[PDB]
Protein backbone atom coordinates (compact mmCIF):
# COMPACT_ATOMS: atom_id res chain seq x y z
CA UNK A 1 0.00 0.00 0.00
CA UNK A 2 1.07 3.58 -0.55
CA UNK A 3 0.27 4.01 3.26
CA UNK A 4 -2.02 2.93 6.08
CA UNK A 5 -5.41 4.37 7.83
CA UNK A 6 -6.91 5.16 4.62
CA UNK A 7 -9.38 3.41 3.18
CA UNK A 8 -8.60 2.97 -0.67
CA UNK A 9 -5.98 -0.13 0.61
CA UNK B 1 1.32 21.23 14.05
CA UNK B 2 2.94 18.14 12.60
CA UNK B 3 6.47 18.39 12.91
CA UNK B 4 9.61 16.15 11.69
CA UNK B 5 13.08 17.57 13.35
CA UNK B 6 15.80 15.21 11.96
CA UNK B 7 19.29 14.84 13.51
CA UNK B 8 22.12 17.41 12.12
CA UNK B 9 24.65 17.65 9.26
CA UNK B 10 27.30 14.64 8.87
CA UNK B 11 30.85 14.22 7.76
CA UNK B 12 31.87 10.57 6.74
CA UNK B 13 34.72 8.73 5.18
CA UNK B 14 33.92 6.26 2.52
CA UNK B 15 33.24 2.76 4.35
CA UNK B 16 31.83 4.29 7.04
CA UNK B 17 27.69 3.97 8.03
CA UNK B 18 25.83 6.98 8.91
CA UNK B 19 22.43 6.92 11.70
CA UNK B 20 19.86 9.74 11.02
CA UNK B 21 17.34 10.54 13.02
CA UNK B 22 14.05 12.60 12.88
CA UNK B 23 11.39 13.29 15.93
CA UNK B 24 7.86 13.86 14.88
CA UNK B 25 5.03 15.64 16.72
CA UNK B 26 1.79 16.59 16.72
CA UNK B 27 0.12 13.69 15.21
CA UNK B 28 0.22 10.19 16.95
CA UNK B 29 3.13 8.65 16.05
CA UNK B 30 2.27 4.66 15.05
CA UNK B 31 -0.52 5.76 13.07
CA UNK B 32 1.66 6.99 9.70
CA UNK B 33 4.47 5.54 7.74
CA UNK B 34 7.32 7.59 8.09
CA UNK B 35 9.07 7.38 4.68
CA UNK B 36 12.75 8.32 3.89
CA UNK B 37 14.33 10.54 1.13
CA UNK B 38 17.44 12.09 -0.39
CA UNK B 39 18.32 14.36 -2.98
CA UNK B 40 22.13 15.29 -4.22
CA UNK B 41 23.04 18.42 -4.30
CA UNK B 42 21.14 19.53 -7.56
CA UNK B 43 19.58 15.99 -8.19
CA UNK B 44 16.04 14.59 -8.37
CA UNK B 45 14.85 12.82 -5.23
CA UNK B 46 15.11 9.21 -4.75
CA UNK B 47 12.75 7.25 -2.31
CA UNK B 48 14.95 5.29 0.52
CA UNK B 49 12.10 3.06 2.41
CA UNK B 50 9.78 3.52 4.98
CA UNK B 51 8.99 2.01 8.41
CA UNK B 52 5.28 1.55 9.94
CA UNK B 53 6.02 2.42 13.93
CA UNK B 54 2.97 0.48 14.73
CA UNK B 55 4.88 -3.35 14.50
CA UNK B 56 8.11 -1.99 13.16
CA UNK B 57 7.83 -3.37 9.34
CA UNK B 58 9.59 -2.09 7.19
CA UNK B 59 10.30 -1.53 2.67
CA UNK B 60 12.69 -0.62 1.20
CA UNK B 61 13.80 0.62 -2.71
CA UNK B 62 15.47 -2.03 -4.16
CA UNK B 63 18.83 0.27 -4.70
CA UNK B 64 18.58 0.41 -1.01
CA UNK B 65 17.93 -2.90 0.04
CA UNK B 66 21.19 -4.09 1.14
CA UNK B 67 22.43 -1.29 2.58
CA UNK B 68 19.56 0.79 4.62
CA UNK B 69 18.22 -0.25 7.76
CA UNK B 70 15.02 2.18 8.90
CA UNK B 71 13.62 1.38 12.53
CA UNK B 72 11.01 3.81 14.46
CA UNK B 73 11.24 3.95 18.81
CA UNK B 74 7.80 4.22 19.44
CA UNK B 75 8.70 5.54 22.88
CA UNK B 76 10.50 8.59 21.99
CA UNK B 77 8.15 9.02 18.48
CA UNK B 78 11.79 9.03 16.90
CA UNK B 79 12.20 7.48 13.25
CA UNK B 80 15.88 6.29 12.30
CA UNK B 81 17.78 5.28 9.12
CA UNK B 82 21.27 4.36 8.95
CA UNK B 83 23.20 3.54 5.54
CA UNK B 84 25.96 1.78 5.80
CA UNK B 85 29.14 0.97 3.33
CA UNK B 86 29.23 5.33 2.24
CA UNK B 87 30.75 6.96 -0.50
CA UNK B 88 30.67 10.10 -2.05
CA UNK B 89 28.51 9.13 -4.54
CA UNK B 90 26.24 9.20 -1.07
CA UNK B 91 26.68 12.96 -0.79
CA UNK B 92 23.26 14.23 -0.47
CA UNK B 93 20.60 15.35 1.91
CA UNK B 94 18.10 12.97 3.96
CA UNK B 95 14.66 14.14 4.43
CA UNK B 96 11.93 12.15 6.25
CA UNK B 97 8.28 12.29 5.22
CA UNK B 98 4.92 12.08 6.36
CA UNK B 99 2.03 11.26 3.83
CA UNK B 100 -0.89 13.94 3.69
CA UNK B 101 -3.89 13.81 6.36
CA UNK B 102 -6.68 12.82 3.40
CA UNK B 103 -4.39 11.35 0.84
CA UNK B 104 -1.25 9.23 0.25
CA UNK B 105 0.95 12.01 -1.22
CA UNK B 106 3.79 13.34 0.92
CA UNK B 107 2.71 16.53 2.57
CA UNK B 108 5.12 16.86 5.43
CA UNK B 109 8.90 16.77 5.58
CA UNK B 110 11.80 17.75 7.87
CA UNK B 111 14.27 19.66 7.16
CA UNK B 112 16.43 17.84 5.79
CA UNK B 113 20.24 16.23 7.03
CA UNK B 114 22.98 16.54 4.97
CA UNK B 115 25.50 13.45 4.67
CA UNK B 116 29.05 14.70 3.03
CA UNK B 117 31.22 11.60 2.02
CA UNK B 118 34.37 12.22 1.49
CA UNK B 119 38.30 11.60 2.56
CA UNK B 120 38.43 15.00 2.90
CA UNK B 121 38.55 16.32 6.74
CA UNK B 122 36.38 19.15 7.97
CA UNK B 123 37.93 22.84 7.86
CA UNK B 124 36.87 26.50 8.41
CA UNK B 125 37.62 28.67 5.74
CA UNK B 126 40.15 31.96 4.90
CA UNK B 127 38.33 34.85 4.47
CA UNK B 128 40.00 37.32 2.05
CA UNK B 129 38.82 41.02 0.95
CA UNK B 130 38.10 41.73 -2.34
CA UNK B 131 38.19 45.76 -2.07
CA UNK B 132 36.56 48.10 -4.52
CA UNK B 133 37.75 50.84 -6.92
CA UNK B 134 28.32 55.52 -9.92
CA UNK B 135 28.13 52.36 -8.18
CA UNK B 136 31.49 50.06 -7.00
CA UNK B 137 31.64 46.51 -6.08
CA UNK B 138 33.06 44.64 -3.09
CA UNK B 139 33.44 41.38 -1.47
CA UNK B 140 34.55 38.50 0.54
CA UNK B 141 36.45 35.31 -1.01
CA UNK B 142 35.47 32.58 1.22
CA UNK B 143 37.98 30.22 0.58
CA UNK B 144 39.30 26.32 1.06
CA UNK B 145 36.95 25.23 3.52
CA UNK B 146 34.59 21.66 3.72
CA UNK B 147 32.06 20.65 3.92
CA UNK B 148 29.75 22.87 2.45
CA UNK B 149 27.42 24.62 4.20
CA UNK B 150 28.88 28.62 4.54
CA UNK B 151 26.56 31.37 4.85
CA UNK B 152 27.83 35.14 4.49
CA UNK B 153 25.87 38.65 5.49
CA UNK B 154 26.88 41.68 5.33
CA UNK B 155 27.26 44.57 8.39
CA UNK B 156 25.40 42.06 10.53
CA UNK B 157 22.64 41.85 8.48
CA UNK B 158 22.67 45.69 7.91
CA UNK B 159 23.16 45.70 4.12
CA UNK B 160 21.11 42.67 2.47
CA UNK B 161 20.36 44.88 -0.74
CA UNK B 162 22.78 44.21 -3.85
CA UNK B 163 24.44 41.54 -1.96
CA UNK B 164 24.99 37.97 -4.35
CA UNK B 165 26.38 34.79 -2.72
CA UNK B 166 27.59 33.29 -5.04
CA UNK B 167 27.36 28.80 -5.11
CA UNK B 168 30.35 26.93 -3.65
CA UNK B 169 32.83 25.68 -5.96
CA UNK B 170 34.83 22.02 -5.76
CA UNK B 171 38.01 22.57 -5.95
CA UNK B 172 41.03 19.92 -7.71
CA UNK B 173 41.89 19.77 -3.55
CA UNK B 174 38.51 18.30 -2.57
CA UNK B 175 37.98 21.97 -0.62
CA UNK B 176 35.14 24.06 -1.49
CA UNK B 177 35.53 27.83 -2.24
CA UNK B 178 33.09 30.34 -3.02
CA UNK B 179 32.88 34.59 -3.27
CA UNK B 180 30.14 36.93 -1.54
CA UNK B 181 29.73 40.30 -3.86
CA UNK B 182 27.39 43.79 -3.42
CA UNK B 183 27.48 46.48 -4.91
CA UNK B 184 27.43 49.97 -3.17
CA UNK B 185 27.13 53.72 -4.10
CA UNK B 186 31.04 54.70 -5.11
CA UNK B 187 30.97 57.53 -2.26
CA UNK B 188 30.31 55.11 0.11
CA UNK B 189 33.67 54.24 0.19
CA UNK B 190 35.87 55.68 3.28
CA UNK B 191 32.86 56.36 4.81
CA UNK B 192 30.68 53.47 4.93
CA UNK B 193 32.95 50.47 6.89
CA UNK B 194 31.57 47.16 5.43
CA UNK B 195 31.98 43.80 6.90
CA UNK B 196 31.33 40.35 5.49
CA UNK B 197 30.35 37.75 8.42
CA UNK B 198 31.43 34.28 6.96
CA UNK B 199 29.77 31.06 8.95
CA UNK B 200 30.81 27.67 8.59
CA UNK B 201 28.45 25.48 11.35
CA UNK B 202 30.14 22.24 10.51
CA UNK B 203 34.12 23.83 11.62
CA UNK B 204 31.97 25.86 14.06
CA UNK B 205 33.52 29.00 12.78
CA UNK B 206 32.28 32.50 12.41
CA UNK B 207 34.74 35.08 10.48
CA UNK B 208 34.12 38.75 10.52
CA UNK B 209 36.49 40.50 7.89
CA UNK B 210 36.52 44.02 6.98
CA UNK B 211 37.12 45.08 3.43
CA UNK B 212 38.55 48.64 2.73
CA UNK B 213 39.76 50.06 -0.43
CA UNK C 1 10.16 -1.27 -13.45
CA UNK C 2 8.09 1.58 -13.20
CA UNK C 3 10.54 4.79 -14.75
CA UNK C 4 9.14 8.20 -14.30
CA UNK C 5 10.79 10.42 -17.29
CA UNK C 6 9.80 14.27 -17.14
CA UNK C 7 10.49 16.33 -20.01
CA UNK C 8 11.99 19.31 -20.23
CA UNK C 9 14.53 19.49 -17.60
CA UNK C 10 14.55 23.03 -18.26
CA UNK C 11 11.94 25.99 -19.20
CA UNK C 12 11.88 29.06 -18.95
CA UNK C 13 8.86 31.10 -19.10
CA UNK C 14 7.35 34.91 -19.47
CA UNK C 15 4.92 36.01 -17.11
CA UNK C 16 1.69 35.19 -18.25
CA UNK C 17 2.27 32.78 -20.70
CA UNK C 18 1.37 29.02 -20.20
CA UNK C 19 4.19 26.06 -19.89
CA UNK C 20 3.30 22.17 -19.53
CA UNK C 21 5.51 19.88 -17.71
CA UNK C 22 5.52 15.41 -18.84
CA UNK C 23 5.90 13.04 -16.45
CA UNK C 24 5.99 10.02 -18.72
CA UNK C 25 5.96 6.71 -17.88
CA UNK C 26 7.02 3.03 -19.51
CA UNK C 27 3.37 1.69 -18.15
CA UNK C 28 0.15 2.96 -18.05
CA UNK C 29 -0.17 3.71 -13.79
CA UNK C 30 -2.65 5.90 -12.28
CA UNK C 31 -2.64 8.12 -9.31
CA UNK C 32 0.00 10.61 -10.21
CA UNK C 33 1.48 13.08 -7.24
CA UNK C 34 3.37 16.34 -7.85
CA UNK C 35 5.51 18.29 -5.87
CA UNK C 36 6.94 22.10 -6.02
CA UNK C 37 10.61 22.51 -4.31
CA UNK C 38 12.60 25.73 -4.21
CA UNK C 39 16.07 26.38 -3.29
CA UNK C 40 16.82 25.22 0.21
CA UNK C 41 13.37 23.61 1.19
CA UNK C 42 11.92 20.23 1.07
CA UNK C 43 9.17 19.96 -1.78
CA UNK C 44 5.61 20.90 -0.79
CA UNK C 45 2.81 18.43 -2.14
CA UNK C 46 0.97 20.04 -5.04
CA UNK C 47 -1.37 17.61 -6.41
CA UNK C 48 -2.25 14.19 -5.31
CA UNK C 49 -5.02 12.19 -7.27
CA UNK C 50 -3.19 13.04 -11.03
CA UNK C 51 -6.07 16.34 -10.68
CA UNK C 52 -6.38 17.26 -7.16
CA UNK C 53 -4.60 20.43 -6.17
CA UNK C 54 -3.01 20.49 -2.71
CA UNK C 55 -4.57 22.85 -0.11
CA UNK C 56 -3.35 26.72 -0.48
CA UNK C 57 -2.34 25.82 -4.51
CA UNK C 58 -4.11 28.25 -6.73
CA UNK C 59 -5.96 27.39 -9.08
CA UNK C 60 -3.94 27.99 -11.91
CA UNK C 61 -2.14 24.91 -11.43
CA UNK C 62 -3.90 22.25 -13.60
CA UNK C 63 -3.21 18.44 -12.75
CA UNK C 64 -3.62 15.74 -15.48
CA UNK C 65 -2.78 12.56 -17.38
CA UNK C 66 -3.87 9.46 -18.43
CA UNK C 67 -2.14 6.00 -19.71
CA UNK C 68 1.42 6.42 -19.89
CA UNK C 69 1.63 10.49 -20.30
CA UNK C 70 1.05 13.28 -16.88
CA UNK C 71 0.86 16.51 -16.99
CA UNK C 72 1.25 19.73 -14.51
CA UNK C 73 -0.12 23.05 -15.87
CA UNK C 74 0.51 26.76 -15.22
CA UNK C 75 -1.70 28.82 -17.64
CA UNK C 76 -0.78 32.32 -15.87
CA UNK C 77 2.93 32.06 -15.04
CA UNK C 78 4.02 34.10 -11.63
CA UNK C 79 7.24 34.77 -10.46
CA UNK C 80 6.83 32.82 -7.78
CA UNK C 81 5.82 29.64 -9.50
CA UNK C 82 9.93 29.68 -10.42
CA UNK C 83 10.71 26.59 -8.96
CA UNK C 84 11.48 22.95 -9.94
CA UNK C 85 8.66 20.30 -10.26
CA UNK C 86 8.41 16.49 -9.34
CA UNK C 87 6.19 14.12 -10.33
CA UNK C 88 5.63 10.76 -7.94
CA UNK C 89 4.03 7.27 -8.21
CA UNK C 90 3.36 4.12 -6.03
CA UNK C 91 4.17 0.86 -8.22
CA UNK C 92 3.86 -1.98 -5.59
CA UNK C 93 5.69 -2.77 -3.47
CA UNK C 94 7.39 1.15 -3.94
CA UNK C 95 7.98 4.75 -4.04
CA UNK C 96 9.20 6.46 -7.28
CA UNK C 97 10.14 10.24 -8.54
CA UNK C 98 10.64 11.76 -11.80
CA UNK C 99 13.57 13.79 -12.90
CA UNK C 100 12.56 16.91 -12.29
CA UNK C 101 11.22 19.86 -14.34
CA UNK C 102 13.38 23.19 -13.24
CA UNK C 103 11.22 26.55 -14.19
CA UNK C 104 12.98 29.90 -14.24
CA UNK C 105 11.53 32.98 -15.63
CA UNK C 106 12.14 34.80 -18.80
CA UNK C 107 12.51 38.62 -19.05
CA UNK C 108 14.19 41.44 -21.07
CA UNK C 109 18.11 40.88 -22.26
CA UNK C 110 20.23 42.67 -19.87
CA UNK C 111 23.92 43.12 -19.98
CA UNK C 112 26.28 42.05 -17.29
CA UNK C 113 28.45 44.60 -15.07
CA UNK C 114 31.56 43.76 -14.83
CA UNK C 115 34.31 43.88 -12.13
CA UNK C 116 37.99 42.35 -11.85
CA UNK C 117 39.85 42.45 -8.36
CA UNK C 118 43.26 42.03 -7.80
CA UNK C 119 44.39 39.69 -4.75
CA UNK C 120 44.48 40.17 -1.37
CA UNK C 121 47.99 41.12 -0.54
CA UNK C 122 47.02 38.48 2.94
CA UNK C 123 46.34 35.69 0.36
CA UNK C 124 49.40 36.85 -1.65
CA UNK C 125 51.96 35.71 1.39
CA UNK C 126 49.93 32.35 1.88
CA UNK C 127 51.62 31.56 -1.87
CA UNK C 128 48.48 31.24 -3.60
CA UNK C 129 46.37 34.19 -6.04
CA UNK C 130 42.91 34.26 -6.92
CA UNK C 131 41.98 36.66 -9.13
CA UNK C 132 38.04 37.39 -9.40
CA UNK C 133 35.82 38.62 -11.89
CA UNK C 134 32.32 39.81 -11.61
CA UNK C 135 29.61 39.43 -14.10
CA UNK C 136 26.29 40.99 -12.18
CA UNK C 137 22.85 41.04 -12.91
CA UNK C 138 22.10 39.70 -16.62
CA UNK C 139 20.30 37.79 -18.58
CA UNK C 140 20.22 35.30 -19.76
CA UNK C 141 22.27 32.64 -17.58
CA UNK C 142 24.81 32.34 -21.05
CA UNK C 143 27.70 34.24 -20.79
CA UNK C 144 31.39 33.87 -22.08
CA UNK C 145 34.12 34.96 -19.68
CA UNK C 146 37.76 34.93 -20.64
CA UNK C 147 40.95 35.27 -19.18
CA UNK C 148 44.36 36.85 -20.49
CA UNK C 149 47.86 36.89 -18.81
CA UNK C 150 49.72 39.46 -20.58
CA UNK C 151 47.27 39.30 -23.52
CA UNK C 152 48.21 35.22 -23.15
CA UNK C 153 44.66 33.17 -23.08
CA UNK C 154 44.34 31.19 -19.67
CA UNK C 155 42.91 28.01 -20.26
CA UNK C 156 42.03 25.33 -17.44
CA UNK C 157 42.99 27.85 -14.38
CA UNK C 158 39.82 29.41 -13.51
CA UNK C 159 36.55 28.02 -12.50
CA UNK C 160 32.79 29.07 -12.57
CA UNK C 161 29.56 29.55 -10.62
CA UNK C 162 26.54 30.97 -11.34
CA UNK C 163 23.28 32.33 -8.89
CA UNK C 164 20.36 30.93 -8.88
CA UNK C 165 17.71 33.47 -10.53
CA UNK C 166 17.37 36.67 -8.52
CA UNK C 167 13.92 36.74 -6.83
CA UNK C 168 13.27 40.65 -7.45
CA UNK C 169 14.55 41.49 -11.16
CA UNK C 170 15.06 37.85 -12.25
CA UNK C 171 18.75 37.89 -13.62
CA UNK C 172 21.53 35.93 -13.16
CA UNK C 173 24.97 36.60 -11.63
CA UNK C 174 28.54 34.70 -12.48
CA UNK C 175 32.06 35.11 -11.02
CA UNK C 176 34.62 33.61 -12.40
CA UNK C 177 37.92 32.72 -10.30
CA UNK C 178 41.27 32.35 -11.92
CA UNK C 179 43.96 30.75 -9.59
CA UNK C 180 47.60 30.43 -9.07
CA UNK C 181 50.58 30.61 -7.19
CA UNK C 182 52.70 33.55 -6.06
CA UNK C 183 55.29 32.82 -8.23
CA UNK C 184 53.21 32.42 -11.67
CA UNK C 185 51.58 35.18 -10.30
CA UNK C 186 54.78 37.55 -10.48
CA UNK C 187 55.91 36.44 -13.51
CA UNK C 188 53.03 38.69 -15.05
CA UNK C 189 51.86 42.37 -14.85
CA UNK C 190 48.44 42.80 -16.68
CA UNK C 191 45.56 40.31 -16.10
CA UNK C 192 42.57 41.16 -18.19
CA UNK C 193 38.82 39.52 -18.15
CA UNK C 194 36.75 39.79 -20.90
CA UNK C 195 33.60 39.08 -21.13
CA UNK C 196 30.63 38.10 -23.81
CA UNK C 197 27.40 37.92 -23.63
CA UNK C 198 24.00 38.59 -25.89
CA UNK C 199 23.25 41.62 -24.31
CA UNK C 200 26.81 43.18 -24.99
CA UNK C 201 27.30 45.00 -28.93
CA UNK C 202 30.60 43.69 -28.76
CA UNK C 203 33.18 42.00 -25.92
CA UNK C 204 34.13 44.05 -22.88
CA UNK C 205 37.41 43.83 -21.17
CA UNK C 206 38.04 44.34 -17.02
CA UNK C 207 42.49 44.36 -16.57
CA UNK C 208 44.52 46.03 -13.63
CA UNK C 209 48.00 45.77 -13.74
CA UNK C 210 50.11 44.18 -11.07
CA UNK C 211 50.76 46.65 -8.51
Same mark, same amino acid.
Given at each position: ???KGLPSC | QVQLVQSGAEVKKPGSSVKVSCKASGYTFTNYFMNWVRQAPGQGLEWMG?? &??? *???? &?? %??????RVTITADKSTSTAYMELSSLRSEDTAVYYCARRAMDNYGFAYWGQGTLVTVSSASTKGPSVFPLAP????? !?????? &????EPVTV?? +?SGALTSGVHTFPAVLQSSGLYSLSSVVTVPSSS??? *??????? +?????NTKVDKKVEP | EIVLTQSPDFQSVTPKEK????????? %? !????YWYQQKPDQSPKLWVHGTSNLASGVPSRFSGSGSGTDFTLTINSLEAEDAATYYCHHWSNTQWTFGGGTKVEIKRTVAAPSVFIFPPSDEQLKSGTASVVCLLNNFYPREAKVQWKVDN? !? *????? *??SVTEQDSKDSTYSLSSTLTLSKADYEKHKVYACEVTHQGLSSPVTKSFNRG
Open positions: CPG | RV &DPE *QGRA &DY %AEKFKKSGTAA !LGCLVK &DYFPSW +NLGT *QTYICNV +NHKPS | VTITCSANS %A !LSYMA !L *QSGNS *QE
